[PDB]
Amino acid sequence: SGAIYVGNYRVVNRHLATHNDWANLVWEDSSRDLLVSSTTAQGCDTIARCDCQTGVYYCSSRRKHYPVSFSKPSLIFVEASEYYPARYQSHLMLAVGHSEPGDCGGILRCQHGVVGIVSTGGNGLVGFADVRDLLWLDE
Ligand SMILES: NC(=O)[C@H]1CCCN(C(=O)C(F)(F)c2cccc(F)c2Br)C1
Ligand SMILES: [Zn+2]
């Protein structure tokens, strides 16, 4: 679990979105595993606007933050699950690191701010759904 609170928006994994998230939907994309919903309280997370390939992510399965080197956002094949069939997920970034299902929603950050959230993993790897291109989150 985990979310990004920026202004009047809440960013979550699309497969983990609530009834309230769908009732106040702003935008959603199955190919990215993202869903954005409106909120009444104001958020204060800063989103990075950069091309950093190093950062720190939070891993709830270990109660620890880990430094990681990660790839540039791209189309990567993801094994079928109870939420999605076998498909290519876009805007996905991989790193060598610990993750298990339940870690989805953990924030990845560089010095410039929030880069994205845990979305895939397995085999000693971790995938993060990028959010730096969503310029409308700030405006
Ligand atoms: N983005 C997706 O399509 C997800 C949906 C949920 C399922 N999924 C997974 O990767 C996962 F849960 F099985 C997983 C397995 C081992 C380590 C992990 F950190 C994770 Br996350 C794909
Ligand atoms: Zn950065």
Side-chain angles (χ1 to χ4, degrees), residues 1 29 54 59 70:
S1 55
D29 190 345
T54 83
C59 170
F70 58 89

Side-chain angles (χ1 to χ4, degrees), residues 4-9 41-47 109 114:
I4 310 164
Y5 296 99
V6 53
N8 288 322
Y9 302 120
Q42 208 78 28
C44 45
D45 279 311
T46 288
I47 309 295
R109 292 183 64 91
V114 173

Side-chain angles (χ1 to χ4, degrees), residues 11-33:
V11 190
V12 279
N13 294 84
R14 190 196 187 270
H15 73 269
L16 293 184
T18 72
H19 289 271
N20 175 79
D21 281 325
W22 278 97
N24 295 307
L25 175 69
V26 170
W27 170 73
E28 56 73 35
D29 190 345
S30 298
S31 73
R32 298 175 66 157
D33 184 40

Side-chain angles (χ1 to χ4, degrees), residues 122-137:
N123 294 316
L125 302 164
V126 51
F128 311 104
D130 185 58
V131 308
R132 310 176 270 186
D133 63 322
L134 312 176
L135 314 186
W136 52 269
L137 292 177

Side-chain angles (χ1 to χ4, degrees), residues 18 53 111:
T18 72
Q53 279 182 250
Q111 69 196 115

Side-chain angles (χ1 to χ4, degrees), residues 42-61:
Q42 208 78 28
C44 45
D45 279 311
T46 288
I47 309 295
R49 302 302 182 191
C50 74
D51 75 348
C52 280
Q53 279 182 250
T54 83
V56 182
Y57 84 101
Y58 178 67
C59 170
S60 70
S61 83

